[PDB]
Design a protein around this ligand. Sequence first.
Ligand SMILES: C[C@]12CC[C@@H]3c4ccc(O)cc4CC[C@H]3[C@@H]1CCC2=O
Lengths: 278, 278
Amino acid sequence: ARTVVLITGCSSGIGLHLAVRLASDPSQSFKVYATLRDLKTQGRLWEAARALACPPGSLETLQLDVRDSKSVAAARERVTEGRVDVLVCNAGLGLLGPLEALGEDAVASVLDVNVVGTVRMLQAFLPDMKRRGSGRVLVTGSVGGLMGLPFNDVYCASKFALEGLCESLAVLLLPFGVHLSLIECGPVHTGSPEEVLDRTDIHTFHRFYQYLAHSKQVFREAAQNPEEVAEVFLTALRAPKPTLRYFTTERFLPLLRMRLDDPSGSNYVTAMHREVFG
Amino acid sequence: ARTVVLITGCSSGIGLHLAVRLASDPSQSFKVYATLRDLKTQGRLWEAARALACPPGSLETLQLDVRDSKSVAAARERVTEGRVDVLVCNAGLGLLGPLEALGEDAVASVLDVNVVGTVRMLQAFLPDMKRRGSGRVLVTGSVGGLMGLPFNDVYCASKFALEGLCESLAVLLLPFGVHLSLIECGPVHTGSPEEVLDRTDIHTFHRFYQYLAHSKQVFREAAQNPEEVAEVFLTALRAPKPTLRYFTTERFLPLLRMRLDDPSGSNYVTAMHREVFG
Ligand SMILES: C[C@]12CC[C@@H]3c4ccc(O)cc4CC[C@H]3[C@@H]1CCC2=O
């Protein structure tokens, strides 16, 4: 009997590639429920399933919208085996811009998806793992959940919020046989300017499109294959005593060293200001 | 007038005490706007103010509910000086419990008050500080924002979120002349047991009560007074170049240094499990 996997946010990126990576695994150990907010976006996932030739029955799609605890319950029930061995909380939104230019609705949505969404999935699925005494939870983490990034203020808030949610749980889950791990990802290959101008000062406006210039270049240098990222999830699954945190790259570990060296936080602020601007 | 300070969450606790501390300064250096979710609760604040003979016009109250961006904008407009020199984001909620046992709404309230509420203040008050080239922001933080605490998953999520919000902002804010600081509080003085078993499991139920007993005894030994913490906001207030973070206590700097040491997190997790579950 196979390892049942359920994964959120499989329409693209990490979730897509991780789902087909598990379904197509030559061992045929994995039964994957790939869940999508909107089933109409499932096309690239089935293209990829065939290109890696996932066996029939190895991959199924469910609608699961992490904003809606009813969508969550209903997908849980569509799990024919009636347990989950591996849960991957991958679903996530980004949000980029000067804080004062972000809509209130966009800010709340990011917290609701990235943070509350993950709470909803843990509330539906964690008890059964606890009762049974086994299960793996993997949560897609970010470099921005480790260190703040200018103009990603709310994104980082949500990603730090996961660090805090997951670390708290993990302390409780240490002796339960349920293993929670975060997978810390750097960049990965998967308002319009007058609204931005109206809602902010001239100097922030300049610094923002400066930041976008710098950001795009880092992304060209720095963005990983998502197959390579997916494989780290695999590494974590295979681990018999998995750590709370895995990292998909070492590129950002120097900065993380320095930031945690200095517990009043001002070293990090200068270095990152410098790295990003000039 | 003076140094204009606006403080949220001033009906009791840190906010009430910082408000009167500042209003009763013998230099009369400070004009304090103490804001309350509900002005009808302003009884205790004014009692304290008179107890310290705060001069007239040293202290004023406004209604400000950090869940309503319109409440926020109305209170901004009421600042007759048309500037704020020190903004104190202090409004905060706790949530204690096994995750699966907390209501969805309670969870979303905490994030909306603690995180989104603070975003709304930053959105409303930072623009004028940037354009003016000056300003301080002080934010009530927590050791629970720097290390995960069991059964406080959502509280911690909310406090880690503030870490990421403020750090991201600070990197941008360095050339603008606007300083952001978190005041890292430790603990601070101010369903039925079958419902818990019912919504949770047997291992969890045991851990929870073990936790309750354990943490009572940290509150007896460790809990600082609101006045002591208020005093650390003053240091930060005054500092010629304030750091990103200030600590109110030494006590948890060991448990914290085990976290920063092992980025994998396995050291911190085992430590805190032992420290808590004994
Ligand atoms: C978990 C804890 C008890 C509860 C404390 C607590 C409680 C409330 C709060 O707002 C912050 C904190 C921070 C420290 C926490 C302690 C660390 C060691 C311990 O046993």
